[PDB]
Amino acid sequence: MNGAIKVGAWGGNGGSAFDMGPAYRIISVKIFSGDVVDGVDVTFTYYGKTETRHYGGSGGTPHEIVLQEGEYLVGMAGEVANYHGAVVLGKLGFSTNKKAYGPFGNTGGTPFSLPIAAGKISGFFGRGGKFLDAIGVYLEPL
Template sequence: MGAATKILDIRVRHGGAIDAVQIMYEVDEKIQWTPQYGGNGGDLTEISLQEGEFLTSISGYYGNFSDLYVVRSLTFGTNVSTYGPYGAEEGTAFSVPVEDGKITGFFGRFGALLDAVGVYLGPN
């Protein structure tokens, strides 16, 4: 996805693992959706961030699922609330708290499921 000015909405497909993630973001005053990163399985949850709300953390679990090493669970923290966990909290825990600034984008690897996820950071 790359870095954005503002993340507006997050769609997560989840079940026993994270099937897919899709982000609505603003960059250069244009609003657009990323492609869906991952497959079409699992339940769909949509997180709509409010005006002034921004991502301050992402955490979750990764591990083996159906003989694949994937992201099992995701939780999103903002300056207002916490969303999740989505998926199964099984495997090895990870956490990316942002002390000063905000999460402005995501990168990762995917196939039918989300294999890996990382974040881009920017100032508040």
């Protein structure tokens, strides 16, 4: 709606769907991982208020991506894996216009990659349960 562009999600069909929408300003992403991607904390600002939403389960070790001034997410990549009978994100990483982060997680499977030649990530959607079943992104120019 309202001219959104959503690509993905990559991953499985388990868990519960989530959708952050594209209205907020992402300030940091915290990926929790061990053998696979357990979940993600997305911290954003909106009208001067800072909020964090958690998706996926409670396991794993955190790996934070803190966006500096003038830093944007311009890529996402990873692996879709079969783990404990579930189709989940086995690995997940991101690129900014300054640096590559990760991938985080240690289970291979079917790779995916989202290089963004023109544009940036402006929000997330996906599925979460005990682990991070799936992830997708909203895109916008620059």
